[PDB]
Amino acid sequence: MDAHIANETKQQMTRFAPALVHVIVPDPLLARAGVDPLAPFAAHAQTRYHGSGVCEPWVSVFAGHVQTGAVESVLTLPPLQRPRGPGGLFVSLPLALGAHFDGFTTAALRVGARELVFTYDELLPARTRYNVDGERLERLCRQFANYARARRVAPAVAAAGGHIDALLPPAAATIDGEAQLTRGGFDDPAAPHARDADR
């Protein structure tokens, strides 16, 4: 996740592209692309418009390849649990947009030898999925509560554990990243207004 932060700062401070996008290419994709992980990386990228053949000069981006479960490394904190699952390199590609982001104009990625293409129409989804992260976060806080209650480490954290206890139920907890891609549905910006108008 440090890769995404580094790329965001390098983009905002210098403006080497209009906007950005965060991507987690997993293991089997890289494997079928002909590229191998666990080897020295050197990431680059360029944006190639369609129908003309004008390519902006390449730009180096910071990529960091995790080894064990990747998706959970975005969701969990170190001392409370360990991730699990497949793992691929984090990266962030540059874009070219601002008024009507054109379709069919790709964003070409470059790794040690091979190049991958990512059509805009494929990269940028309309609706996001922010409603399930509340369900994730409550479980995370309950997790920290049951840790602080049992491990008996320090008083300052014990007070916070007691507060969390008295705030929400202490039942149990576990965080699962794979379940995030399955269970959820896409969040739209209306439904709160539906509930409100029904109120």
């Binding site: 190639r48 390519c55 030898a113 091979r114």
Partner: protein
């Protein structure tokens, strides 16, 4: 489509070159010095017997192969090095110093039964005119024994920055061959933006 068309053009060039150099009913002189032991007259006679089918299978193979596997090879490397001049704009490679014309980049091929490329990275050999029109081989940058035509089971092909190809059967027998690349001009800068850096 762009990469497939470019590769088709390069292969058409090379195959037409060897085609024209062999069209006239030839007798090929071993252009590289190699002392052959006196019991191996049988083996060079066998090379003589299998030269035609070997060249035919080589053409078939070099044609049918996909494009992702070819771009790292020396064929498209020297084709890009050739296009780099006429493009009227500067261009720098990614991971290799410029070719410094005079050096032939080799791509081997097996000579027994099934014909498959063996070399992962190209071999940077340098020809040098020697006694009685028999160019001397020597190679810096790579270190791979049996350089051209030294050992059996290695058909050796290589094209210079100036796009002049040679073919070295086992034992040292072969011929030079010129190359004429036929490709439009309205698309040169796209391909060179995708295969170089333009700095």
């Amino acid at each position: 489509v762009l990469l497939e068309r470019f590769r088709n053009a390069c292969v058409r060039a090379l195959l037409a070159g060897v085609r024209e150099s062999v069209r006239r009913e030839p007798r090929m002189r071993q252009i590289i010095e190699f002392a052959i032991r006196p019991r191996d007259r049988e083996a060079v006679l066998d090379v003589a017997g299998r030269a035609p089918a070997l060249l035919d299978a080589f053409a078939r193979r070099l044609e049918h192969t996909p494009a992702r596997e070819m771009v790292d090879s020396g064929l498209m490397t020297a084709a890009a090095a050739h296009l780099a001049a006429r493009a009227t704009a500067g261009y720098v490679t990614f991971e290799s110093g410029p070719l410094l014309g005079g050096v032939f980049l080799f791509d081997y091929y097996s000579a027994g039964g099934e014909v498959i490329r063996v070399t992962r990275a190209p071999l940077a050999v340098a020809v040098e005119p020697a006694t009685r029109g028999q160019f001397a081989c020597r190679f810096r940058g790579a270190s791979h024994r049996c350089l051209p035509g030294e050992s059996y089971a290695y058909l050796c092909v290589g094209v210079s920055r100036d796009l002049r190809a040679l073919v070295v059967l086992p034992g040292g027998f072969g011929f030079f061959a010129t190359l004429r690349l036929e490709w439009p001009a309205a698309l040169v800068d796209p391909v060179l933006e995708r295969l170089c850096r333009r700095v």
